[PDB]
């Protein structure tokens, strides 16, 4: 049916459970007493790299293959830099094998010193999709090495989802799962496992209205991708859903929440102040989610809540600008 | 025998329990291979009110009677705006009873701002040592409410032990605690517990080289109080020790370890960035010890270290000066 089965989720959970943290759950009575709810805080801030993004990429390392003639990857490549570049560079390392970050010549000198801290070889290209394209598959096929797409590679996806297995085992009497959506792995991920294990539980997706393709797209009924690159301060969910997330999200998760620049700041203080968790700004999405306007609509019988705190990946220094 | 034993402190734990968290024990890869050990940490930055002072400040506002008729506080009363004051106000508000805070006429306009916002009512003194306590020895009378000693009062070194009763059934193979010390109420409470409980277990007190005390005090055999109030990023732990807390002190804790003002800061940063907990500096403490050179000499038998978070009340946009 989809791209992705609960199979697949359950044998990426067995493929990257050694090499990974069981997260916490926490809670917050501060939260708690503000939102209505009971909820639940999935702590993927504390997952190695800093992300939970370490489930798909050590999934795809341990799972897709280069080739017909060769079952082992030699080498992993992406043209992702962040939070997705700093996972797929440990789960290489993990491995054994070396990574390659596809980076324009325009890319910011920060960005390019910190893909060399977090261990990967920097291959350039022009600031163009014919130049990006060309380069790393280029790189892919002189490497032996596999690509390993943010958001959209199936096994990505699997690996994603089994912070929904946790949950789930975690937090038995859990109501509702809010999760932040980008590209639509996590959210997919979660939602297939969810709704093959207990589809009684509500899957949410919380959004920025300035990149709020997810929500387009659920309005209209089919793929709308943000038009232009978005601008928002929660950069880990810039990138639109795609082909293989987006029957997924059209079938399986319940409702979308989007939310302001100003609510998703205030959602992230909240959370630093009140939670002490340095959560990045993008991990404040489903917090601003369920403190929203549009949030009171959940019915009074979706009581316990658990929101994915997806990362805690946060520049420290040039973050206090917007506090 | 001490101003507190065991007994208070399962009375303390009896007396808290319904009304704080138990906090989690969190662990860091990263913070285990910079040290050898295996580190555990007790996540008191998660508390309510955002420090361990909490536990101190309710069992003594739900065990001290004040000076009148009825046997519970109607109020109380605070010279804090820190993390005492605002764990004295939130067991105030548990309890029903207002909590007043006695300020000084030339506070800053931030400073009132930000004690109200934790909901203290603010009763205002002539700017001197001798005004403070008068205006706060008149309201707690006229309120028939009490005032708690940050470290020294007996109910609230009973309350600070109930963090290693905890640690103690989180972690059952803990071979030592380590515990940032100003007062020492905090440590006091904790070496009563693990003394008592499992004494095998090691104490370790970790204090800022710029303020000393509790070193040169176990030192010397005798205590030996900062000559001058002391500069530290440690802003929670400017205390010196005290004669309730000291003599526990000088028995049941097994080692006192320094550590250096940049020390304290690169640790901080590094529970920041690497654990994302956004602890005080001065729950930094602790932490600086285990990195510090003097504690990687502790024999490795010592292995399961148990590190008290103790607060995470940090003024975010301060955080820029380091
Ligand atoms: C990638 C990322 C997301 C979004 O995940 P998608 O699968 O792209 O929807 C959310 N939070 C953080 C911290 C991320 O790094
Ligand atoms: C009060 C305090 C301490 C020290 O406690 P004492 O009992 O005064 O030694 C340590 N850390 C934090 C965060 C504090 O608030
Ligand atoms: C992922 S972590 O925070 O680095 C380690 C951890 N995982 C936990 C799960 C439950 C309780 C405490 C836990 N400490
Ligand atoms: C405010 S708190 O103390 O972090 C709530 C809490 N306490 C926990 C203990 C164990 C696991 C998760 C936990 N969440
Ligand atoms: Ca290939
Ligand atoms: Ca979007
Ligand atoms: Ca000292
Ligand atoms: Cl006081
Ligand atoms: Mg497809
Ligand atoms: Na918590």
């Known amino acids: 049916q989809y791209d992705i089965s609960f199979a697949d989720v359950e044998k990426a959970h067995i493929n990257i459970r050694d090499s990974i943290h069981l997260t916490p759950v926490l809670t917050s009575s501060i939260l708690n007493q503000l939102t209505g709810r009971n909820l639940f805080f999935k702590c993927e801030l504390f997952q190695k790299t800093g992300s939970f993004k370490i ?3 050590l999934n795809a390392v341990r799972s897709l293959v280069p080739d017909a003639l060769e079952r082992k990857p030699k080498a992993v490549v992406t043209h992702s830099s962040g939070n997705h570049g700093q996972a797929l560079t440990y789960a290489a390392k993990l491995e054994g094998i070396p990574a390659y970050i596809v980076v324009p010549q325009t890319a910011p000198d920060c960005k390019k010193l ?3 801290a977090y261990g990967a070889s920097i291959v350039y ?4 999709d014919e130049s990006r394209e060309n380069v790393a598959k280029r790189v892919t096929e002189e490497t032996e090495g596999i690509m ?19 949950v789930l085992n975690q937090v038995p009497l859990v109501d509702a799962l ?33 990149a709020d393709d997810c929500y387009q797209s659920k309005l209209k009924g089919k793929l709308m991708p943000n038009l232009y690159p978005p601008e928002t301060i929660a950069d ?3 990138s639109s859903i795609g082909l293989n997330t987006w029957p997924i999200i059209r079938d399986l998760v319940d409702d979308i929440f989007t939310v302001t620049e100003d609510e998703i700041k205030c959602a992230t203080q909240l959370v630093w102040e009140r939670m002490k968790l340095l959560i990045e700004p993008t991990a404040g999405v489903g917090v601003a989610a369920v403190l929203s306007q549009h949030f009171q609509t959940v019915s009074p019988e979706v009581k316990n809540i658990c929101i994915v705190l997806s990362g805690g990946n946060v520049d420290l220094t040039s973050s206090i600008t917007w506090v």
Request: proline letters at 9%; one cysteine or more.
């Open 55 to 57: 489930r798909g990429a």
């Open 114 to 116: 910190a893909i060399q």
């Open 125 to 128: 290209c022009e600031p163009s």
């Open 148 to 166: 390993v797409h943010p958001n959209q590679e199936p096994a990505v996806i699997a690996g994603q989802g089994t912070i929904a297995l946790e």
């Open 178 to 210: 809010v999760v932040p959506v980008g590209g639509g792995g996590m959210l997919a991920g979660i939602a297939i496992t969810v709704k093959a294990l207990k589809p009684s539980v509500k899957v949410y997706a919380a959004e920025p209205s300035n």
């Open 236 to 238: 880990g969910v810039k």
